[PDB]
Every structure is written in C-alpha cells, then in structure tokens.
Scaffold this motif. Structure first.
Motif, PDB file in Angstrom:
ATOM      1  N   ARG A  26       1.112  -1.218   0.150  1.00 24.33           N
ATOM      2  CA  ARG A  26       0.039   0.110  -0.134  1.00 24.33           C
ATOM      3  C   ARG A  26       1.186   1.099   0.115  1.00 24.33           C
ATOM      4  N   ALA A  27       0.377   2.043  -0.377  1.00 26.60           N
ATOM      5  CA  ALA A  27       1.207   3.452  -0.921  1.00 26.60           C
ATOM      6  C   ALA A  27       0.122   4.834   0.426  1.00 26.60           C
ATOM      7  CB  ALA A  27       0.962   3.676  -2.074  1.00 26.60           C
ATOM      8  N   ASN A  28       0.771   5.228   1.076  1.00 24.68           N
ATOM      9  CA  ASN A  28       0.312   6.577   1.999  1.00 24.68           C
ATOM     10  C   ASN A  28      -0.123   7.440   1.163  1.00 24.68           C
ATOM     11  OD1 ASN A  28       2.197   4.785   4.385  1.00 24.68           O
ATOM     12  ND2 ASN A  28      -0.549   4.554   3.794  1.00 24.68           N
ATOM     13  N   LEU A  69      -8.575   5.113  -1.061  1.00 19.71           N
ATOM     14  CA  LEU A  69      -7.615   6.141  -0.342  1.00 19.71           C
ATOM     15  C   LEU A  69      -9.018   7.024   0.452  1.00 19.71           C
ATOM     16  CD1 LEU A  69      -5.000   6.781   0.233  1.00 19.71           C
ATOM     17  CD2 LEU A  69      -5.439   8.330  -2.935  1.00 19.71           C
ATOM     18  N   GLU A  73      -9.920   3.809   3.463  1.00 23.53           N
ATOM     19  CA  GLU A  73      -8.258   3.279   4.543  1.00 23.53           C
ATOM     20  C   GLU A  73      -7.449   4.293   4.482  1.00 23.53           C
ATOM     21  OE1 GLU A  73      -9.220   0.478   6.244  1.00 23.53           O
ATOM     22  OE2 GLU A  73     -11.356   1.281   4.404  1.00 23.53           O
ATOM     23  N   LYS A  74      -7.297   5.804   3.840  1.00 24.39           N
ATOM     24  CA  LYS A  74      -6.044   6.442   3.539  1.00 24.39           C
ATOM     25  C   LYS A  74      -4.555   6.107   3.025  1.00 24.39           C
ATOM     26  N   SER A  75      -4.746   5.244   2.463  1.00 30.51           N
ATOM     27  CA  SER A  75      -4.283   4.448   1.098  1.00 30.51           C
ATOM     28  C   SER A  75      -3.871   3.545   0.199  1.00 30.51           C
ATOM     29  CB  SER A  75      -3.251   3.359   1.562  1.00 30.51           C
ATOM     30  OG  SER A  75      -4.465   2.393   2.577  1.00 30.51           O
ATOM     31  N   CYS A 126      -3.026   1.519  -3.604  1.00 29.95           N
ATOM     32  CA  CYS A 126      -2.999   0.059  -4.208  1.00 29.95           C
ATOM     33  C   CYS A 126      -2.781  -0.290  -5.596  1.00 29.95           C
ATOM     34  CB  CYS A 126      -3.312  -1.166  -3.535  1.00 29.95           C
ATOM     35  SG  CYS A 126      -4.709  -1.576  -3.704  1.00 29.95           S
TER      36      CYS A 126
END
Ligand SMILES: Nc1ncnc2c1ncn2[C@@H]1O[C@H](COP(=O)(O)OP(=O)(O)OP(=O)(O)O)[C@@H](O)[C@H]1O
Ligand SMILES: O=C(C[C@@H](c1ccccc1)C(C(=O)O)C(=O)O)c1ccc(C(F)(F)F)cc1
Ligand SMILES: [Cl-]
Ligand SMILES: [Cl-]
Ligand SMILES: [Cl-]
Ligand SMILES: [Mn+2]
Ligand code: NA
Ligand code: NA
Length: 284
Positions: A164-166, A179, A182-184, A186
C-alpha cells in the motif's frame, strides 16, 4: 562477467516551439534537438517553485519511475538535465495530445473505440503493475495519443514503486474509496480509475461528478453513481466489476488473480491482445 558501466544535454541543444500543455508546476514544450532533428516534449519545472512547495522528492521519483519503463503504451523518458533555474525531462512527443480532448469534442466513443482504447489501457496497467508500480493519477488528461493514435500514458509524478501507499495524491473524480477511507492506495486503486475512465468514454463524464471535491468524495465512498440509458451492456458489467468498494474484489486485482481474468472479460471478446500496439486503431 561485468564490465565497467557504459553527455548531458543543455537547453541550447534545442529549438523550442509551442507549449503543449501546463500543469501546476510544469510547462511542457515541443522541442527539436538540433543535432538529430528529433522532436521531443520537454517537461520543464522551475526549481524555485519546486523548492517552495516541497516537491523536490517527486521530481527525482518521476525520473526514476520513468527510467524503468519501456512499453509501447507509455511516454518514454529519453533524457534529463538541469540549469541554474530549471529542471528538464525529455519525453517522447505524443503528437495527438490528450484522450480527454477527443472525449470533449465527440462526447462519447462508439463501442469499437471504447473496447480498443480500454484494452490498450488494460495492457499498459498490466505492465505497470507487473513492475510493482502504481500510477495513482490515471485519467484521460494523462493518457496521450501518438501520431498513430495509440495511447501513451504519462505523468509519473504521483507514481509509487511498491503493498500500500499512503500519500494523498490524485484527481478527485478518479480517486479510489480506499484512499478516502483507509487513507492508502494499492494497485487496485488504478483499476478503480480504469472503471471511471471506461464509464467516461461511454457516458461523456466520469461517474462521480460535482463542482466541489468534497461532494465527489462523499459519493465515491458510498458508491453513489448510476448508468445512463444505452450504456453498452458488456461495458456496464465490466464497470460494475471495477467500481467495487472492496479493493480486493476488483477484476484485475492481485486478490482476484490479476490481469488474465480481466482480459478475459466478455467486453474484450474480439480483442487480439498480443499485438495491439501494431494494430490500426478504430477511427474516433
Ligand atoms: N509527452 C507529451 N507529448 C505531448 N504532450 C504532452 C506530453 N507530456 C505532457 N503533455 C501535455 O502537457 C500537459 C501536462 O503534462 P503533465 O500532465 O505531465 O504535467 P503535470 O505538471 O504532471 O500536470 P499536473 O501538475 O496537472 O499533474 C499534458 O496533459 C499534455 O497536454
Ligand atoms: O533530481 C534533480 C536533478 C536531476 C534531475 C531529475 C529530474 C529532471 C531533471 C534533472 C539531474 C541530476 O543530475 O541528478 C538529472 O537527472 O540530470 C533535482 C531535483 C530538484 C532540484 C531542486 F531542488 F532544485 F528543485 C534540483 C535537482
Ligand atoms: Cl527554456
Ligand atoms: Cl519545434
Ligand atoms: Cl472538481
Ligand atoms: Mn503530475
Ligand atoms: Na501487458
Ligand atoms: Na497531469
């Protein structure tokens, strides 16, 4: 056996022409290299502006991500250089500009054109995701067209090499629910964008629309959209399998066993995948 490893260009090596486009921090200019007569799109950033807005890391990231890419459906990075005031990316010139331009003018693509351009995007994403890179800003404005009207995906300033990326990056209309909640993001976040794009090709606008980002976000997280009449039935089915809140349930995602099943969708029945980049695109 490994040998030792195997000349930076300068602004004066080029004749610059028209502005091809602009972003928040960039101006993209058509340029001809004097020594070769090759045309390039040169993306130019002002260092002062990049520094003030804390964007230094995303410049290097854009170069490094693009340096990894060598697929027919991606803009190519040929070279980078700088001077005292500016940063320059030498890119392949996509002569026919943004896919968005054609959607705007024509309003809606016919089924053959929708299928073809969707297939090219799918093919591009399969490659990108195979390299463990997520785009995060996939949208028609970042899908360009070359002289033969094949796609050239561009703008890797928001890309991430991986889950994942934040970071909260992207464009509201195409932002995935994960996004937002989850604030992330993929790889599957790009498949959500794909679903938005397919819907846009057919319907003229993306499915979550408003004049305020907040309004758009509220709809995304509740899957608040619907289909117009006459939306191609197989494209509708595909969109419904991409615009899914649970990112692990989207056709094409790793948890759903990747691109084979996506390419197998009935919408692509007529598509020959192996040589898409050598095929003549349907006329828009
Ligand atoms: N390789 C290219 N060939 C032709 N035109 C291009 C190319 N790269 C960019 N452009 C034009 O310039 C516009 C801006 O380029 P790009 O999208 O890479 O800029 P950006 O600064 O990353 O944008 P933003 O700041 O809005 O995210 C493009 O949408 C397109 O119109
Ligand atoms: O990464 C670099 C230099 C880097 C570069 C990267 C992308 C586009 C053009 C040049 C440059 C280098 O020498 O590393 C090169 O690849 O030729 C860089 C990034 C930000 C700043 C500043 F802080 F000034 F904005 C300066 C250099
Ligand atoms: Cl210049
Ligand atoms: Cl020119
Ligand atoms: Cl908006
Ligand atoms: Mn960008
Ligand atoms: Na592929
Ligand atoms: Na862009």
């Amino acid at each position: 056996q490994h040998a030792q490893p195997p000349r930076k260009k300068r602004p004066e090596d080029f004749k610059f022409g028209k502005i091809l486009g602009e972003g928040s921090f960039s101006t993209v200019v058509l340029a001809r290299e004097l020594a070769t007569s090759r045309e390039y799109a040169i993306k130019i950033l002002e260092k002062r502006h990049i520094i003030k807005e804390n964007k230094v890391p995303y410049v290097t990231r854009e170069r490094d991500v693009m340096s990894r890419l060598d697929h027919p459906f991606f803009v190519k990075l040929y070279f980078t250089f700088q001077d005292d005031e500016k940063l320059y990316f030498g890119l392949s010139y996509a002569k026919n500009g943004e896919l968005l331009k054609y959607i705007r003018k024509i309003g809606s693509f016919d089924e053959t054109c929708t299928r073809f351009y969707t297939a090219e995007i799918v093919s591009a994403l399969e490659y990108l995701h195979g390299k463990g890179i997520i785009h995060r800003d996939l949208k028609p404005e970042n899908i360009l067209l070359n002289e033969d009207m094949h796609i050239q995906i561009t703008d890797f300033g928001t890309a991430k090499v991986l889950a994942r990326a934040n970071s909260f990056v992207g464009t509201a209309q195409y932002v995935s629910p994960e996004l937002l909640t989850e604030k992330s993001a993929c790889k599957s976040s790009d498949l959500w964008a794909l679903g938005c794009i397919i819907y846009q090709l057919v319907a003229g606008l993306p499915p979550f629309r408003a004049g305020n980002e907040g309004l758009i976000f509220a709809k995304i997280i509740k899957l608040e959209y619907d289909f117009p009449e006459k939306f191609f039935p197989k494209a509708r089915d595909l969109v419904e399998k991409l615009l899914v809140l649970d990112a692990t349930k989207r056709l094409g995602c790793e948890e759903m066993e990747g691109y084979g099943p996506l390419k197998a969708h009935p919408f692509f029945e007529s598509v020959t995948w192996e040589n898409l980049h050598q095929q003549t695109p349907p006329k828009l």
